Structures are given as C-alpha cells and as structure tokens.
Amino acid sequence: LGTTIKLVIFNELSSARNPNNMQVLYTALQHSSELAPKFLAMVFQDLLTNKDDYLRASRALLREIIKQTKHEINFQAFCLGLMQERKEPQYLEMEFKERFVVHITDVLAVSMMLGITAQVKEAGIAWDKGEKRNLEVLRSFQNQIA
Amino acid sequence: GGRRRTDALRFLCKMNPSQALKVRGMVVEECHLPGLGVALTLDHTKDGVSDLVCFVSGLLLGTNAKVRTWFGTFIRNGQQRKRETSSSVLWQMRRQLLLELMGILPGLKEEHVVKASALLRLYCALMGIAGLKPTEEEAEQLLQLMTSRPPATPAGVRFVSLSFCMLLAFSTLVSTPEQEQLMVVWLSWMIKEEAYFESFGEMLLL
C-alpha cells in the first residue's frame, strides 16, 4: 500500500491515466483487501465530505468494473470496513453530513439499475413458466447484508 | 377493482353483443384493460382464420409501438398469474389459439397453408416480443405444425421458411428426443424436396 500511496501523488497530476490502471486497481482490491482497501476506505471517507459529486462517479466505476470482472467482490473487506474506526478529526469537522447519505442512497439506487434489460423482463415473465431466475444479484446482496 | 370493471364491461357486452367489438376498439384506443379486449374477441368468436389471430397479431405487429409495449406487458404479467388456471383470459386465448392449431393441422391443405403461416407468425410475435413461454402442449402442437408438408406453392415456400426460422429462433421448445427425430426427418424431407420453384432451399443451405 505504501508504494501505491507514494505513486498516487505523481499519478494525480499526470494525465496518462487510462482505464487499465483502474481495472488493475479494482482487481487488486477484489483479490487482496489486506492493504489497498485499508487506504481506499479512508480515501472514500474523505471523498464524501467534498463539495463536488465525486463519490457517485467512483461508486459507478467500481460497480462497472466489478460487474465486468465477473462479480469480483471481496467478502472479507466488509469486516475490515466495519472494524475500521473513523477517529480522525478532519472527518468529524465536516459540516455537510447529509450529503454523504444522499450520495450513498443515489449510488445504491443507480447500482441496482444496472440489471435492467428487456431480456431480464423476459426472464421475469419466464419465472412462473419457463425457468425461475433473475434473482442472483438480490440473493448475493442478502448474503452481503448477512 | 380492475377485475370488477372488466367483469362489468363483459356483462354489458353480453347484454349488447353487437357493440362488443366497438368496446374492444375503445379498449385499444384508450390503451388500457387489454384483458377486456382479449375476452371480448373470445366471446365474439364463441370462416377466415379468426378475429383472435387478426386482433392479437395486429396488436403485436402493428405500426403503433405503444400498443405493442402495452400488450407485451399484458402478456408478461398474465403469464405469472398462477402459471395456469382459467382465472386469466391469457390462458383462455392460449387455449383458443391451440384449438386453431388443431383445426389447421392435418399433408397440409392448399387452403390452410396461409392460415398456418399467419398463425405461425403470430406465435413468433408472442414468444419473441411479448415474452410468452409456451407450455409443453403448446410446443408439441407448434412442432406438429412446422413439420407439416405444404403442397409446393409459393405459400408453401413461405410457410416452410417461417417454420424453419421458428425452429432456428425458438429452438428451446423442442427439448425432447421424439420431437428431435421428427424435426430431423422433416429436415431430410425438406432437403429431398426441390420442386418448390413454383426460395426455401437457399435459406436452408445458407
């Protein structure tokens, strides 16, 4: 994580960033949340206090990358996020708090919309006829909630 | 509420059957209560092909895309209504269409080939646009229809082409060995048959 943090300073100003770097970062986070997720959680926490709408875009990109990576979601990262203590004073001094909740709600609402398809409607019509399906994402979400 | 309104309009039309199709036209104009329209055309049919085939084919394959989406949503929603039982008019009209399938099945007649073609295109519209999933009996009678031998006319060529395209598109409806041997023997007959000059074999080869 230290090397990534050190290179982030140079990468922020550089315009050579491409989707390959984001895909590699998402794959690394999904495969190993031991080091990268620890800093990523703090980075996402800091992004929720900004005035610009940057949490929604990052969440949408992460969801798109995860969907393209065949549901590359780390189950052990949830325990690190729950055990992580937001004890910093900069986060507690942020005046705008409802904005983060609104952004999270919008991200959740837009992430569920990725399953909308006319073929998903035909599978929903096939449920009590052909084959009961179009519900794996919901089941996975229930497991994550558990 | 919708069921009671539909039943009330059904009784009103039973009391004045001359205006039943006018009420069905009002239904397709105002673009709600599709079950009422289906039930009215069913009570009206209760020679041509049928008012049912014309009505639902025009609904699913007309220029108006709003009507197409509306009736497709109707078909999808009705399909989930217990997956059986005469409670929904969807299964009533499905049985009526299946009865028509029995009616035109036999060597296919010269007079029934065009009706078979229209019925087959209607079934294509249903299972393709409307998302209908056929039952085992529906699939069986469909396969019985496709594998028929029309009497080598341009209508026969069109019918064979449409049936072949249905098999290529909705190949999930075979799902059995005896229907597999039926369709391969039908394909072999189709290969042997080359007097269709008076564009089917080109499609098969392609």
UniProtKB/Swiss-Prot annotation, chain A:
It is linked to Neurodevelopmental disorder with cataracts, poor growth, and dysmorphic facies: An autosomal recessive neurodevelopmental disorder characterized by severe global developmental delay with motor impairment, cognitive delays, absent or severely limited speech, dysmorphic features, hypotonia and cataracts. It is found in: Nucleus; Nucleus membrane. This is Integrator complex subunit 1. Coiled coil: none annotated. The chain holds residues 438 to 583 of 2190 of the full protein. Belongs to the Integrator subunit 1 family. Component of the integrator complex, a multiprotein complex that terminates RNA polymerase II (Pol II) transcription in the promoter-proximal region of genes. Component of the Integrator complex, composed of core subunits INTS1, INTS2, INTS3, INTS4, INTS5, INTS6, INTS7, INTS8, INTS9/RC74, INTS10, INTS11/CPSF3L, INTS12, INTS13, INTS14 and INTS15. The core complex associates with protein phosphatase 2A subunits PPP2CA and PPP2R1A, to form the Integrator-PP2A (INTAC) complex. Interacts with ESRRB, ESRRB is not a core component of the Integrator complex and this association is a bridge for the interaction with the multiprotein complex Integrator; attracts the transcriptional machinery.
Swiss-Prot record, chain B:
It is found in: Nucleus; Nucleus membrane; Cytoplasm. This is Integrator complex subunit 2. It comes from Homo sapiens. Component of the integrator complex, a multiprotein complex that terminates RNA polymerase II (Pol II) transcription in the promoter-proximal region of genes. The chain crosses the membrane at residues 159-175. Component of the Integrator complex, composed of core subunits INTS1, INTS2, INTS3, INTS4, INTS5, INTS6, INTS7, INTS8, INTS9/RC74, INTS10, INTS11/CPSF3L, INTS12, INTS13, INTS14 and INTS15. The core complex associates with protein phosphatase 2A subunits PPP2CA and PPP2R1A, to form the Integrator-PP2A (INTAC) complex. Belongs to the Integrator subunit 2 family.
